[PDB]
Amino acid sequence: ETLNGGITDMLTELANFEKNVSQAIHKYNAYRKAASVIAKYPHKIKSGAEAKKLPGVGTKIAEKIDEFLATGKLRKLEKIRQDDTSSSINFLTRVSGIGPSAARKFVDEGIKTLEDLRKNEDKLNHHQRIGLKYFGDFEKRIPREEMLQMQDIVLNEVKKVDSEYIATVCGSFRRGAESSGDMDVLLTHPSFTSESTKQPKLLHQVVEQLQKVHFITDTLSKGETKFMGVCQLPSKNDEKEYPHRRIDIRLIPKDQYYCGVLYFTGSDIFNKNMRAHALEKGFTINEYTIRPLGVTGVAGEPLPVDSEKDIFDYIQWKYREPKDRSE
């Protein structure tokens, strides 16, 4: 956790590079398990030889580990850290809609900077167009202060459209967080569930409403159950406008809400931790359901869930408020 920190962070930097800059999924994949096992290793690694004893740790990485332990650095790392091409990919990739793929492609073409980005906006598709367009606004965290207003407005329209609608802004936000990165809004309705063959308009109705009153400014993507957009607080009586904010809306079959909701609220750790428990308690939990376990190794048979309570009950736990869903 810190006794092996550098070893791990070096290894990540290493790992991460293969993946993006070159396309060495293996190598890349190498560096990760290696960085995964050393993390757990309950002891200060003194040599690679020592490390080497590990699983996933081969000759390759031991080498590095020595140099890193020896001199507080790494040449391969110092060279990568320097290098423009790699540097560049690292950067382009920031634009929402730009994955390594395109990043490497642009790069080759000679599009290294953001400015290059603009001059060749033609080379960008809509997602990426908007990426560029709100590059700044995008990297900026959300004051819960703001979260509360946004949320305010969402709930009002959802309701006005149809009062049967059930929305939940899940996230860090839900878990009390002081700021968040994007607004994740959970959504299901009664007439929509597991079987009842969809109802696209069900998502589409609101998506409109929201754009209707100008809360939605753009659309990253929109399908029958997931809508990816851009929202924005009414820049009040001017002098101060609102940063454009990444927003995601999702439609759940009423019968699988809370699992979903439970799920998305996280945290990752509460998750696993909640997930690890249901196992001992004779179950199974996942993004949509909770099924009892059958001795034959496994089993199925989706339990009927009415609220984030039922799930606990099921695994007979203590209902942990979202605020305290941190671990």
Place this chain on the structure above:
DNA sequence: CATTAGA
């Protein structure tokens, strides 16, 4: 690990 775009 799943959904959407796109070419």
Place this chain on the structure above:
DNA sequence: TCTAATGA
């Protein structure tokens, strides 16, 4: 159709 990207 495949392949990319976003989703902690």
